[PDB]
Write an enzyme that holds these catalytic residues in place. Structure first.
Site, PDB file in Angstrom:
ATOM      1  N   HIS A 246       5.227  13.364 -14.268  1.00 23.48           N
ATOM      2  CA  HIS A 246       5.106  14.183 -12.960  1.00 23.48           C
ATOM      3  C   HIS A 246       6.429  14.362 -12.268  1.00 23.48           C
ATOM      4  CE1 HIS A 246       4.926  10.653 -10.065  1.00 23.48           C
ATOM      5  NE2 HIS A 246       3.988  10.255 -10.755  1.00 23.48           N
TER       6      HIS A 246
ATOM      7  N   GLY B 221       6.952   6.517  -4.123  1.00 24.88           N
ATOM      8  CA  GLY B 221       8.181   6.404  -4.878  1.00 24.88           C
ATOM      9  C   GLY B 221       7.941   5.350  -5.677  1.00 24.88           C
TER      10      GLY B 221
ATOM     11  N   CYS C  33       6.134   5.117  -8.470  1.00 24.79           N
ATOM     12  CA  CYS C  33       5.958   5.628  -9.680  1.00 24.79           C
ATOM     13  C   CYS C  33       6.935   5.457 -10.490  1.00 24.79           C
ATOM     14  CB  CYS C  33       5.574   7.149  -9.390  1.00 24.79           C
ATOM     15  SG  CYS C  33       4.239   7.673  -8.771  1.00 24.79           S
TER      16      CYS C  33
END
Ligand SMILES: [Cl-]
Ligand SMILES: [Cl-]
Ligand SMILES: [Cl-]
Ligand SMILES: [Cl-]
Ligand SMILES: [Cl-]
Ligand SMILES: [Cl-]
Ligand SMILES: [Cl-]
Ligand SMILES: [Cl-]
Lengths: 305, 305
Positions: B41, B143, B145
């Site tokens: 993503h 943030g 991820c």
């Protein structure tokens, strides 16, 4: 979102852990620059445990009586000295993984990360608080002595705790890295016991703010209280006094959530008088007291949900 | 003595964390040998969030569209490929801090350590379980991820989780390191929600054994139960089925403490029917389900108190 018992990343400390042996006794040391710090009780034998005179025990030792091993590398001891309840072993090699560090003593109610170690090898990392009675509710087995507690600010490790012993209730006592004990405890076998403990009130309020930041309001109410009236209820439930400075430290969390500190005290009073009635806060059925206001700001969003 | 939410020491993982940027999107990557693993993503823009076609989005990218930074060193991307929901960025430099590692997928009810990271920089370490509904009750902000979950066996890191998203209830979803999601979740904005969860019965029993090892017996009783009769009560309280294999996995803890597994099931049944009545176990007012039998053996003495 979420709220966990979160430790600092342990790597900077793992690179400092070594094994220290004196005769048949092995425990952990902390290798910073050309010094290894460890509990002085490494020089005690089974006979010396009730009434050791450490000055007397140490004068009988030589550099070569200490075996220090950093993994599979022996470090040669080239000097030794007692620093209160810690031994400082000067070694011939500066630790190349030495981080930026400080030795800081913490207050009762402050939190730190523990790197539990056995034979110089890290086993696990967890968060702890210094209890008001100067014990820590650690997790430590035989051989954990010399494991350290720390906080990290930027790239700098603030060492605050070295593990020395377990008390009869299964809680733990130790020193700062200058070898000064937290609390009235000594490094020998005595009748010593943890005194009565209390709940860290400013931390419980911090944790209620964490719950609100995380989008949970169930325990809030329309009431307020005076600081003096809150302290009267607090005392009754074996809670630490809340001070105006504690109110000022809770300022930023108060501003983020729009809940006045004394309004959160009214919430806490109601939770103390009624209990939680089968409900949870942040996944606990108890009022949690081992998160500081700093811990909550470090972990939680700077935006309330 | 003592019993904490204990994570594995994080250092081996900290040396693998890097920052990955694609346009205006920055998240964390895992740098092992000459590959950087991150959530695919990272190639989504604000417009692509409801219905991204990742094959379509990735064919439009070049190696030079990816900026990878290991601290202050840029790593040059020399290849890229999609691996299910992970991107594999081939870089020109093998990570010299690569530990011995494996990619392992875990089962619902198994635990792991999370190194929460932001902009490639580790923030904290905590323990988590894979919930029966394939979510994790993490602690993650915008943030996070690309942060990973792991277990360590000897010197070998078993990576089991990469963080991809937060669900509307504030629990977390992600993938194994081969990019396959845990649970029915996808890496896009949809109506997806965590399904109903259950309590991990084998873990609650493990944790009752931990309490006994730690010298607490208050909740024990003189009763036993059949497995089938226990499961009838379990089902009623939204507990996972306990299997004969679960009974056999609890064998060693049963042998250490001398409490038959079905006698500990009778204890648990009574705790489910009566509650704890203002008492605690290992400092909790709830039945804890995020310690596995392995976690208890790893942490507790091999001698019962
Ligand atoms: Cl936790
Ligand atoms: Cl050697
Ligand atoms: Cl005690
Ligand atoms: Cl409580
Ligand atoms: Cl804990
Ligand atoms: Cl560069
Ligand atoms: Cl959800
Ligand atoms: Cl419960």
């Amino acid at each position: 979102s979420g709220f966990r018992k979160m430790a600092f990343p342990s790597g900077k400390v793992e690179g400092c852990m070594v094994q220290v042996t004196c005769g048949t006794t092995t425990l952990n040391g902390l290798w910073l620059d050309d010094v290894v710090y460890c509990p002085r009780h490494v020089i005690c034998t089974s006979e010396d445990m009730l009434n050791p005179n450490y000055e007397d025990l140490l004068i009988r030792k030589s550099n070569h009586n200490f075996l220090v091993q950093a993994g599979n590398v022996q470090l040669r001891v080239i000097g030794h000295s007692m620093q209160n309840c810690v031994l400082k072993l000067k070694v011939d090699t500066a630790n190349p993984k030495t981080p930026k560090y400080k030795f800081v003593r913490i207050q009762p109610g402050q939190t730190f990360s523990v790197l539990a170690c056995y034979n110089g090898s890290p086993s696990g990392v967890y968060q702890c608080a210094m209890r008001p009675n100067f014990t820590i509710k650690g997790s430590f087995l035989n051989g954990s002595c010399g494991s350290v507690g720390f906080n990290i600010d930027y790239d700098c490790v603030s060492f605050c705790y070295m593990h020395h012993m377990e008390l009869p209730t299964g809680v733990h006592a130790g020193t700062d890295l200058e070898g000064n004990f937290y609390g009235p405890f000594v490094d020998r076998q005595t009748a010593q016991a943890a005194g009565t403990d209390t709940t860290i009130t400013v931390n419980v309020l911090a944790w209620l703010y964490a719950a609100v930041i995380n989008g949970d309001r169930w325990f809030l109410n329309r009431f307020t209280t005076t600081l003096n009236d809150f302290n009267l209820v607090a005392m009754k439930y074996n809670y630490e006094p809340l001070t105006q400075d504690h109110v000022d430290i809770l300022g930023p969390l108060s501003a983020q959530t729009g809940i006045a500190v004394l309004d959160m005290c009214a919430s806490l009073k109601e939770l103390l008088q009624n209990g939680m009635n089968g409900r949870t806060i942040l996944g606990s059925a108890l009022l949690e007291d081992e998160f500081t206001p700093f811990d909550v700001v470090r972990q939680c969003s700077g935006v309330t949900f």
